[PDB]
């Protein structure tokens, strides 16, 4: 019969897709990003005049 | 006639003879068999482990093939 086929060595992970079904990419479990990214500004500080301490 | 204990020596039993002598093993020849058995030991053992690999991959393939499980 044509039923006989030997594995020989290994599968080596085969990739095949045809049906897909709704694609499905993003679901996971999380609903929200939560507060998003924190506000951070970049401008590079010049010198900053006068120290905070009593002795200057 | 007088009869007493007679003297007999014949072979004298050999006065102090060494019996201890080197036998079978020589020295360098024993290492050729000793280390020779080791080199024969690893070569015979590792070929079986390569034959075990034929079984190993085939055993884990059964898990991948079985998805209704």
Swiss-Prot record, chain B:
It comes from Bos taurus (Bovine). It is found in: Mitochondrion inner membrane; Nucleus. This is NADH dehydrogenase [ubiquinone] 1 alpha subcomplex subunit 13. Belongs to the complex I NDUFA13 subunit family. Complex I is composed of 45 different subunits. Interacts with CARD15, but not with CARD4. Interacts with STAT3, but not with STAT1, STAT2 and STAT5A. Interacts with OLFM4. The chain holds residues 32 to 74 of 144 of the full protein. The lineage of its organism: Eukaryota, Metazoa, Chordata, Craniata, Vertebrata. The chain crosses the membrane at residues 27-46. Accessory subunit of the mitochondrial membrane respiratory chain NADH dehydrogenase (Complex I), that is believed not to be involved in catalysis. Complex I functions in the transfer of electrons from NADH to the respiratory chain. The immediate electron acceptor for the enzyme is believed to be ubiquinone. Involved in the interferon/all-trans-retinoic acid (IFN/RA) induced cell death. This apoptotic activity is inhibited by interaction with viral IRF1. Prevents the transactivation of STAT3 target genes.
